[PDB]
């Protein structure tokens, strides 16, 4: 639930779109087992899809370990330092492909509740409303019931 979970505001990493778009994913590390049905899909991914993904994403360094620990995994490290570890246990080639593409397109910011669907650093152009906008002034600035 929202009250039982952290929340953040919509944001980018370094104003990622203003000047140029920089892919925030910088590292992928696939720990895959030579033997083991759990990593069969990961093996097929390494055989058939990892090279094409690598050449499609030249900014992402991709390591393949062929020696996992406790499960076959993909660890995605983003420029902002976030590290997202995803088990590729018993996932098919297409599942791993979609997961990897999601990691590629996603930023390092936490996947938690986002308070607002929008973020303006300059919400107002004509001046944020304050009680005295739309209030007429009076001669000599006399407050109501003022004698002089």
């Amino acid at each position: 639930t929202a009250r039982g979970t952290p929340s953040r505001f919509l944001a980018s990493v370094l104003h990622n779109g203003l000047g140029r778009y920089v892919q925030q994913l910088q590292r992928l590390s696939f720990s895959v087992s030579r033997d083991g049905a759990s990593s069969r899909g990961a093996r097929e991914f390494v055989e058939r899809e990892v090279i094409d993904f690598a050449r499609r994403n030249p900014g992402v360094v991709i390591y393949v370990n062929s020696r996992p620990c406790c499960v076959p995994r993909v660890v995605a490290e983003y420029l902002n330092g976030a590290v997202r570890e995803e088990s590729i246990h018993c996932k098919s080639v297409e599942e791993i492909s979609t997961l990897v593409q999601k990691l590629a397109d996603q930023s390092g910011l936490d996947v938690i509740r986002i308070r607002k669907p929008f973020h303006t650093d300059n919400p107002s152009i004509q001046g944020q409303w304050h009680p005295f906008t739309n209030k007429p002034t009076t001669f000599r600035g006399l407050r109501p019931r003022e004698v002089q």
Binding site: I51, Y63, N65, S66, R67
Partner: protein
């Protein structure tokens, strides 16, 4: 004593048809030697044993019955087989500069 293990890599020789027809003449003659039938056990064994000894690559039992003709034998022997592991098959495949593969086995 166990000799060095026979590498399963096999590259068909360039003069494969010539060598095969020489062996066929040695074992069995008529025109279109490609279509000579190997129905005879003696002749099939002689030809296939000679080829296996010479080329260091024998017809497996699974494919053995499919060698109905010298054409089939030629087809089997002109298809290469590589014994390199998947590690080699991947690393020596022009990996892009951002992809690094390491093997701890």
């Amino acid at each position: 004593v166990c000799p060095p293990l026979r590498s399963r890599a096999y590259t068909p020789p360039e003069d494969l048809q010539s060598r095969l027809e020489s062996y066929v003449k040695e074992v069995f003659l008529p025109s279109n030697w490609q279509d000579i039938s190997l129905e005879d056990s003696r002749l099939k064994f002689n030809l296939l044993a000679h080829l296996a000894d010479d080329l260091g690559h024998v017809v497996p039992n699974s494919r053995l019955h499919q060698m109905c003709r010298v054409r089939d034998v030629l087809d089997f022997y002109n298809v290469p087989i590589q014994d390199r592991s998947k590690f080699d098959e991947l690393s020596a495949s022009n990996l892009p500069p951002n992809l690094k593969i390491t093997w701890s086995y």
